[PDB]
Amino acid sequence: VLDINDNEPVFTQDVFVGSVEELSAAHTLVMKINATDADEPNTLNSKISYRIVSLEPAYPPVFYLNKDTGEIYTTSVTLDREEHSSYTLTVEARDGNGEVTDKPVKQAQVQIRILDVNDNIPVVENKVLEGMVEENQVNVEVTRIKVFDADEIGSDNWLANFTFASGNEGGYFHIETDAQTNEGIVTLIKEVDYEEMKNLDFSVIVANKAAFHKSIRSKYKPTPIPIKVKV
Amino acid sequence: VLDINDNEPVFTQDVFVGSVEELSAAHTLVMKINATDADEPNTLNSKISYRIVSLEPAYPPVFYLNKDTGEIYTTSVTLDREEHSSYTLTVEARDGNGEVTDKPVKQAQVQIRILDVNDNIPVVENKVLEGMVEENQVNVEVTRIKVFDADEIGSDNWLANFTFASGNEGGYFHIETDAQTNEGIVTLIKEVDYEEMKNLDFSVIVANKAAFHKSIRSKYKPTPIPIKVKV
Amino acid sequence: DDNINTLWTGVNPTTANCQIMASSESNDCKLILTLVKTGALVTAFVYVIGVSNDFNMLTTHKNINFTAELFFDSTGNLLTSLSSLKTPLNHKSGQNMATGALTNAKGFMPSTTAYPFNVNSREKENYIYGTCYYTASDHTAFPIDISVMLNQRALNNETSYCIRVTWSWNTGVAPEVQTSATTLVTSPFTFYYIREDD
Amino acid sequence: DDNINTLWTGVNPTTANCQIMASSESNDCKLILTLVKTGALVTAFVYVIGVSNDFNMLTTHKNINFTAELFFDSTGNLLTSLSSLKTPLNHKSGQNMATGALTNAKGFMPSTTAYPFNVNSREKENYIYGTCYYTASDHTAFPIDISVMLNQRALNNETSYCIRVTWSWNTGVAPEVQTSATTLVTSPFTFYYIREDD
Amino acid sequence: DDNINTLWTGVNPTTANCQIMASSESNDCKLILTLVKTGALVTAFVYVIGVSNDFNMLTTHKNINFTAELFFDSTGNLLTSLSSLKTPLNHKSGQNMATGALTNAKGFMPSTTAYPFNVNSREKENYIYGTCYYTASDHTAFPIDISVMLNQRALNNETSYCIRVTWSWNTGVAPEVQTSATTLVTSPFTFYYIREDD
C-alpha cells in the first residue's frame, strides 16, 4: 500500500460551526478546521491542502484560510457585524501535493457567526417630546422615548440605559426600559397639583445598557433630550 | 498727433461675462478684461489703468483686479456660492499715467457667476418615517424622504442618491429620486401577505448624486434613517 | 557649531518680510519660518504674523484660504522674486538672521528622491497635513487646517525645490468682528520631511 | 557631549516630584518633562503620572482641568518653591537626572524676543496648543486638550521665564469608575518653541 | 558623524521590504521607518507605501486595520523572521541604507525603564497615539488613526524590544473605488519615546 492518490482526506464533521467577534484585528484565529488522513501520515495525502471554494456572502475578502494547517483567520478587512451577521464557507480540503484537477474531493461546510460588539450609539428618533400631568397623578407612563441602536436586537449592546441629566431633583420620575422594543418608558412617582400651574421640565441622557466599545467611547458626546412636562 | 489725454481706452465689449468656481484658492484667474487703446501703443494712453469702481454685492473683498493687465483674480477670502450666486463689477479703465480726476472715462460691466461645488451634505428633514403595506401590494410609493441640499437647486450637487444600508435583502424596494423637489420616492416590488404579520424594517443612506467635494468627504459620516414599514 | 543647523527668518523682524496676498502692493505680514536639520529629517517650524490692515482684516470672515510659496534654486537659496517670503533665509545669530552666505543650504531642502517632481504614480508622497490655531481676542482657539506641499512645481528651469504651506479655515462664525480684529497670529506649526543630501 | 543637550526630570522617579493640586499636602504625582535643544528650537516632551489617590481619582469625573507651573530664574534654574515641579531639572545621566550644576541652562528657556512679558499687542504669540490621550482601563484613548503658555507672568522680580502646561478634558462619560480607576497616565506630548540664547 | 544618529529603512526601496498582511505570500508593501536619536528621545518617523494589488485594494473598503510588528534582539538588531519588516535597518548613507554593522543600535530602542514588559500597574505608559492621513485620488485627506505600542511582548526569549504601529480608519465612505484605487500611501507620522541607554 503506497501513498497514491487513491482516497480522500477524511474530515471530522461536515457542517463546522465556529465564531469570531466584530471589529477584531487582523490575523485573529477563528477556528482550526479539523481533518485527518485516511492514508499514511507524513505522506502526500498527509499534506491536507485546505482550500476555500465559496464564500456565500462573497464580496469582501474577510476571512483567510491557512492552506497548510486549516486555521481560519481574519484579514485586514475589518468585520462589521451589522452588514453580515453570518458567513458560510464551503471549504474543500484536498490531498496529494496540490494537484488542482477535476478529481472530486470531500467538501466541508464552515458556518461562522460574528459576535456583536457595542459599536453604535443609540439615537433618539423623535425630536419633540411632551407629557401632561394633573392632580394626584402617580405611576403614569405618559411618554416613551424611541431609541434606535444597531447592535444585535435583543442584546445588552442594544438595550437602552436612560439617566437624568437635569430636572429630576425631587425624585419625580424613574425610567424603565422595555426590552421588546427598546423604549424609554418613564414613570411618575410624585404627585403634583395642576392648580399650582408649575413645571416639571427635565432632560434625559440615553446610552446602551452595556458599555460602549473602543472606537465610540471618547467620541460619545451626549446631548440631553429636553422632555417638557406641562403641569 | 501726440499721446495727450484726448480720447478714451476703447473696450472690447460693454457687458463682460465670465465665471469662476466655488471654493477656489487664492489668486485664481477669473478673466482677463479685454481693452484696447485708441491712441498709439507704448504710450501713457497705452497704460490702461483698469480700476474697479463698484462691487454691487460690495461687502466681502472677494475679487482682485490687476490694474496693469486687467486680469481679475480671487483673494484669500474664499468664495461661498450659497450666499452670493453672482457678482457685478462695474469696472472703469482709465488711460494716462494714472491721474485720478473727474474727467469721465469709459465704464465697462463685468458679470461673474460662481460655479457651485458639492460642499453640502443633504439632510433628512423629517425624523419619524413610516409606511404601510397589505396583501398583494406592489408598485406602491408609500413614503417619500424629504432631503435638503444647499448646492444650486437643479444640479447634480443637489439631487439625492439613496442607497439601502440594511433591511432590503430580498429586493423588496427600489428608490427613485424626484428632480423637481429632491424627494426620496421609494417603491414596492415584492408582495407581502399582511396576514403574515411580519415586518419590512430597513434603513436608507442618503447622499448627493454627484460625489462630495474636498472638505466634506472624510467628514461625511452617514447615519442610517430607520424607516419602519408595518406589514 | 549648532548655529549652522538652523535656517530661518529671524525672530520678530522689524518689518514685514512676506507678501501673502497678491492684492497687497508691498509686504503685508511677518512670516516666521525655521528649518532645523534633525538627523535625516528637517524639523520645520512655521507661522505667520499679520501686519497690514487688509491682512489682519481676514479674521473677520469665515472662509479664509491663504498660502505661502517658497521656491528655492539648485543650491537651496530662496528665489525672492517668485516666493511669498521676500527676504532670504539665513543661519542663526542669536535671535536674528546671520549675515554671511549659506553653508550647505541644500541639505535643508525637501529631497527629490522622497518627493519627486511631476511623477503621477508617486503623487501622494508630497502632501503633509496638520493643524494650527488662532487665539481669538477672548482667548478662544480656532483650529486652522494646514496643508504642506513639497516639490510640486518648477515655475522656470531655475526652481529646484518648492515648499507650499496653506492655511485655511471654514468656521461657523468669524473669529473676530471689525472692531475686535487686532492681529492675525497663527499658533506655530511643526512638520517633518526627509531632507535632501548636502 | 550629547548629555548636556537635555534638561529633564528623570525617567520614572522613585517618588512623586510634582504637586499639581493645591489640595494635596505633599507631592501627588510624577511629572516627566524633557527639554532637548533642537537647533534654534526646544523639543519639549511632557506628561504626568498620577501617584496620590486623590489625583488618580480625577479619571472618575467628566470635567477635569489641572495645570503645571514652571517658573525659572534669570539663569534658567527652576524656582521649586513657586513651581509645580518640586525637584529641579538636570542633564542626562542614563535614565536618571545628573547630579552636577547646570551648563547653559538659559539656552533651554522660551525666548523673550519671541515670547515677551506683558505685551498686549503681541499676546497671541505666547500660546501653544495640542492634544494628548489617556488610555482607559479597557484600552480606550480619551483625547486630552493641552494648552501651553510661555512667559506670561513673573510672580516676583526673581521669575524670568514661565512655562504653563494645562491638561483638560470635557468628555461625555468619565474615563473610569471608582473601582476601575487605577492611575492617571497621560500620553506624551511634544511641542516646540524658539529658545533663548545661551 | 551625523550618519550614525539615524536608523532607517532606506528612501524608496527598489522592492517591497515589508509583509503587513499574513495573507500575502511575499512582501506586499514598502515600509519607510526612520529613528533619529534626539537627546534622550527618539524621533520616530514612519509611513507605508502599498505595492501589491491586494494591499492597495484596502483603500476600497471602509473598515481597515493593519499593523506592523517590529521585534528587536538584545542588541537592537531587527528579528526579520518575526517582524513585519523583512529587511534589517541600517545607518545613513545618502538616501540609502548603510551596508556595515550597527554602531550602538541599542540606543535607539524604547527603554524598558520607561516602557516595561508585563507590568500591569504600569500598563498605560506603553501607549502612543496620533494621526496620519491618506491623500485620495481627488486630493482628499482621510485621517488615519495610529496607535503605537512599545515593549508589550516577547514572542520568545530572544525578543527584547517591541514596537507595534497600527494604522486604522473607520470612515463613512471608502477613500477610493476599484477603478480609482492606485496606491495606499499614508502621510508620514512622527512620535517620540524615551530611548534605552547605549
Author numbering:
A (entry chain D), B (entry chain F): 100 to 330
C (entry chain B), D (entry chain A), E (entry chain C): 128 to 325
Sentences from the paper on this structure:
In the present study, we investigate the binding mechanism of the ARD causing agent HAdV7 to the EC23 module of DSG2 using biochemical and biophysical methods.
Extensive 3D classifications and refinements indeed show that the complex mainly exists in two forms, i.e., a HAd7K trimer can interact with two or three EC23 modules hereafter named HAd7K-(EC23)2 and HAd7K-(EC23)3, respectively. There are 40% more particles in the final 3D reconstruction of HAd7K-(EC23)2 than in the one of HAd7K-(EC23)3. According to that statistics, it follows that the main stoichiometry of the complex by cryo-EM is two EC23 modules per HAd7K trimer. HAd7K-(EC23)2 and HAd7K-(EC23)3 were solved to 3.5 and 3.1 Å resolution, respectively, which allowed the fitting and refinement of two atomic models using the existing X-ray structures of HAd7K and EC23. The overall root mean square deviation (RMSD) between HAd7K-(EC23)2 and HAd7K-(EC23)3 (without the third EC23 module) is 0.5 Å. Each EC23 module interacts with two different monomers of the HAd7K. A small loop in the EC2 domain which contains residues S175 and T177 interacts with a β strand of HAd7K through putative hydrogen bonds with N190 and N192. For the EC3 domain, the main interacting residue is R316 which fits into a pocket formed by two loops at the surface of one HAd7K monomer.
